[PDB]
Every structure is written in structure tokens, then in C-alpha cells.
Design a protein around this ligand. Structure first.
Ligand SMILES: Nc1ncnc2c1ncn2[C@@H]1O[C@H](COP(=O)(O)OP(=O)(O)O)[C@@H](O)[C@H]1O
Ligand SMILES: Nc1ncnc2c1ncn2[C@@H]1O[C@H](COP(=O)(O)OP(=O)(O)O)[C@@H](O)[C@H]1O
Ligand SMILES: CC(=O)N[C@@H](CCC(=O)O)C(=O)O
Ligand SMILES: CC(=O)N[C@@H](CCC(=O)O)C(=O)O
Ligand SMILES: [Mg+2]
Ligand SMILES: [Mg+2]
Lengths: 258, 258
């Protein structure tokens, strides 16, 4: 089988029925026209931010990573490993896609350990075993993986989805594309930056151009690019007409060069 | 491979760390001493009742089944398919058990359709395809399945865990044991009833002895018993010393006769 292609899904578009319908329409068209096996890794920081409101809880992110206290890991796991994951599985079913929902601990796909006591139950993701997912792919299923993981001691961990995607990419030797709610990395004037290198990324970060979630995203992209030795793109899945070319490997956002 | 044994886990014991540690200890001991493949199906009505409190929402059950409005299916899916499911996967990991979390729609394991518009997103579970789970079992994994499902049209459905377990039992041609927070079905004086038949069940229900969740449970048990042609037990997993004999097939609660 060919090297898989991991499509990481994130952004506020995860809360759009029209966006999801358009996306799954394009996924089906791609699947039925390409032999390359697909794997979906999803985030859902928005679903969490909403549930923390209905719950009246605060949201603190220490440089892109959400502080996850022990008293909030269950709620977060519910939102990400449950709600977000099963919502995507429902859309796949609606589109006759045979999918299987998983989290990082299934088949030890992605190894996770506590990153920093200051962050709480936030995990550091690293390559695991590709056996389970490789078998699922060889049997014709579309794995849909959340970013919740678990340590060997049995503690649930919240992994930022971008880092989970990169770790899984190395595990599977797969290509990676990071889809968000913005047309790639934007510059000081808010215009799309076509190509990105580690040196340029550093500059923009120091200048304060790349902040919050995009800092974590560009770093995960660079890691994947140098690890896989292939370019990694950051693009938007907001506009239907661009979806086709996007999956075809066309530069639609910011291409991260190894 | 032998016919699997589905262990359905429910009750308030799902909220007990001591109970969970004791249970997984006995599961490991059973697994390492029996060739019969295990499959876990879990409920978690308690996790839901708590989340509906922190949210300040009402809980209505029309004869054992929780009314699930469209505006609550995502929250419920989060609690059951997410929190409850991943909590059990963490305990399995803690005990070196290679498990894989699934929901009813994975591999179309259990077919689900809307049961009644009066109930909202509550599903009617029926046998599906045993291919995915049979493969997981043959590869050495312990499937841990939640009771959330999805219709062919892509709508998430809340299935009462007892009914999901029975449907999966028929699908896999597996034996079934329903574990709860009570020592089986109790009579008018609150004493354990050793054996149960369809005729006796009807009587007790009409008399008001068997109510709420136990009505759904005894009915699912009877269906499984007549469908599989084998006895189905309803017992408690509260006391550690009883766990061994329980899994060994000893009468610890109420044995449902076909
Ligand atoms: N230079 C930048 N270019 C583009 N987006 C940026 C930049 N700096 C910060 N962002 C923020 O990063 C967000 C995307 O990251 P995030 O919210 O974590 O979503 P996700 O990871 O689910 O795709 C964009 O919505 C934007 O608000
Ligand atoms: N005759 C009865 N015998 C035993 N338990 C009963 C009976 N009638 C009602 N119950 C209730 O059924 C409950 C178990 O059902 P339920 O709460 O749905 O838990 P679960 O399905 O997770 O095991 C018991 O805790 C008890 O409160
Ligand atoms: C640790 C951490 O930041 N986690 C992410 C996971 C979801 C995502 O990437 O969208 C979070 O927002 O909670
Ligand atoms: C429909 C329905 O009653 N669902 C169950 C599922 C969990 C269980 O059986 O514990 C419920 O309480 O929400
Ligand atoms: Mg993000
Ligand atoms: Mg019940």
C-alpha cells in the first residue's frame, strides 16, 4: 500500500455543517479517485472552549498549549475523544465511508507522557506503533483519530492536535497536511505567506507575527517536514472550490519546507 | 477462536477507583488464564446524570430509556463515547491490556435506527457485522465499546447499554454477562432472586417489583438468552472476592434462563 496521507482537521470550521458537508463530499471524491490511504486526525479546541463556557470555566494556554488541570481532563476528553470524534464518524457514515474512531492510545499508535507539571494533563506526543492503523488501512477503513492519549501509568492526556498529527505521521511514514480556518500563515499585514522555512518561522515568531495556535502549528509542521523529508502544508478548508486542488497537492496556503 | 464473552459494565461502580482497580485486576487474571476472547460493552448513565447537573439540565426516562433531545445528544455522546470509554481504556492501559475503544458504528458492529420520535435521539439496536471486532479479537485486542451509535443518515444515537450489549452478543455469537451495582434482580423484600424466566419477569414487572433500569436490563437479558440459547446473568461487580467465580460462570446474581 502507498504511504498514507494524514489530513489534520481543525479550526472553527469544525462547527459548520455546510463546511463539513462540503469537506466530506471532497473526501469521498478523493478516496474514490486515489489509491493513497487516508487517515484523519482532528482537533476541536472550539468544542472545548464552548463546553467550558456552559460550565463557566476559564481557558489558559501557555504558549499554544491548553493548561489541563486534573479536574478538567475528563470534560476535555469527552469533548475531543467523544463529541468531536463521533461527530466526524457520523459525517463519514452519512457519506458511506467505512471509518473507525480511535484515540492516541489505541494500538499504542502514539506514545504520550506528561509534558510539564505546569500544564497539568497535557501530553508530549512521540512515534508509537503503526501496526493497528496499518491493518485498518489495509482492510479498507478510514481511521479518524482524536488527540487524547494515555500514559503507560493510565493517566489520560490532552495532546495538541497538531503535535499528535506530526507524531502519527512519523509513526506511519505518512505525508501530512494541516487544515485550519485561515489560508495558511499570514504576515504582519494579514496576507498569506506562500513558503516557510525554519529560519523564517523563527523571525516571524520573534516579531510577534505568528502567535498562539499558529506557533504550535508551524513548529509541528517543521518537525514533520524535517522528519519525513517532505513538504508539509498549512491551508484552509473553508472554500469548496479549493478543496480538490488542495488534496491534489497544490499550494493553497503555506508550504513548510524541510 | 472460541465464542467471545461480552462483559457489560454499568452501575455507580463506574465512578469508583477502588472498584475499577479491583475489576481490572480480575480481568487480567481471567485473560491470562482463559483462551476465551473478551469484549467489554459499557454504560455510564451516572457520568451523564452528573454532567447534566453541572449543566443544570433535567433527566427524563420513559420506561428505562433516557429522553435524548437533539440539543443534548452531543453532550451525552461526549460523556459516554468519550469520557466513559476513554476512562476504561486508561485502566486497561494501566494494567498492560492492549485495548481498542469503539462505538456501535465502528465496522457497523451494531445497526442503529431512531426508536421513537418521543424519545429523541435514542436508538434501537440490532445485529450488525462482526467482521471488525472478530479481526480485533483474532489480533489480540480487547475491544471496549460504548453505547452511542449512528444511523445510516449520519445521526448520532444514544442506545441504552444493556440493549447495545445484547445486540452485539447476537452479532458476535457471544455469551453475555450484565454487571451492575446490585446483586442481581431483587424481590419485594429486596432479596436476590436466583433464577429468572420470561413468565416470572412479567409478573414482577406488573407488580412493580422490577422498575426503571432493571426493566430494560431484564428484557435485554431475556432477549439475549432466547437468541443465543444460553443463560445470561445479571450480577454485581462490587465485591472483589466474588469476581473470580463470577467470570468462571458461577451463579452470583440472577441467572436468566432462555
Ligand atoms: N501569523 C498567523 N497566521 C495565521 N493564523 C495565525 C497567526 N498567528 C496566529 N494565528 C491564529 O492561529 C489560529 C489557528 O490555530 P488554532 O486556533 O489553534 O486552530 P487550529 O489549530 O484548530 O487550526 C488562526 O485562527 C489565527 O487566529
Ligand atoms: N427489582 C429490582 N432489582 C434490582 N435492581 C432494581 C430493581 N428495580 C429497580 N432496580 C434498579 O435498577 C438499577 C440498575 O439499573 P441502572 O441504574 O440502569 O444501572 P445500570 O444499567 O448501569 O446497571 C439498580 O441500581 C436499582 O436501583
Ligand atoms: C494541549 C492542548 O492544547 N490541546 C488541544 C487539543 C485540541 C486541538 O489541538 O484543537 C486543546 O485545545 O485542548
Ligand atoms: C437511551 C439510553 O437510555 N441510554 C443510556 C446509555 C448509558 C447506559 O445504559 O448506562 C443512558 O443513560 O443515557
Ligand atoms: Mg490549534
Ligand atoms: Mg441502565
Amino acid at each position: 500500500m502507498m504511504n498514507p496521507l494524514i489530513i489534520k482537521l481543525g479550526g472553527v470550521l469544525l462547527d459548520s455543517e455546510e463546511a463539513l458537508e462540503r469537506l466530506f463530499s471532497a473526501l469521498v471524491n478523493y478516496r474514490e479517485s486515489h489509491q493513497r490511504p487516508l487517515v484523519i486526525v482532528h482537533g476541536g479546541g472550539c468544542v472545548v472552549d464552548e463546553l467550558m463556557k456552559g460550565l463557566n470555566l476559564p481557558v489558559k494556554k501557555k504558549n499554544g498549549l491548553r493548561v489541563t488541570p486534573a479536574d478538567q481532563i475528563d470534560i476535555i476528553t469527552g469533548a475531543l475523544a467523544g463529541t468531536a470524534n463521533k461527530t466526524l464518524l457520523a459525517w463519514a457514515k452519512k457519506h458511506q465511508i467505512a471509518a473507525v474512531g480511535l484515540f492516541l492510545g489505541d494500538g499504542d499508535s502514539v506514545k504520550v507522557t506528561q509534558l510539564d507539571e505546569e500544564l497539568g494533563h497535557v501530553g508530549l506526543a512521540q512515534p508509537g506503533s503503526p501496526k493497528l492503523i496499518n491493518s485498518l488501512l489495509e482492510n479498507g477503513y478510514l481511521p479518524v483519530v482524536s488527540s487524547i492519549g494515555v500514559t503507560d501509568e493510565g493517566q489520560l492526556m490532552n495532546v495538541n492536535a497538531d503535535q499528535a498529527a506530526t507524531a502519527l505521521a512519523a509513526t506511519l511514514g505518512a505525508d501530512l497536511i494541516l487544515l485550519s480556518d485561515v489560508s495558511g500563515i499570514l504576515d504582519g499585514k494579514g496576507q498569506r505567506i506562500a513558503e516557510m522555512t525554519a529560519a523564517k518561522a523563527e523571525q516571524l515568531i520573534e516579531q510577534g507575527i505568528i502567535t498562539d495556535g499558529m506557533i504550535v502549528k508551524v513548529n509541528a509542521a517543521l518537525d514533520a517536514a524535517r522528519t519525513l523529508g517532505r513538504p508539509v502544508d498549512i491551508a484552509s478548508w473553508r472554500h469548496a472550490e479549493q478543496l480538490p486542488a488542495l488534496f491534489n497537492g497544490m499550494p493553497m496556503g503555506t508550504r513548510i519546507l524541510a
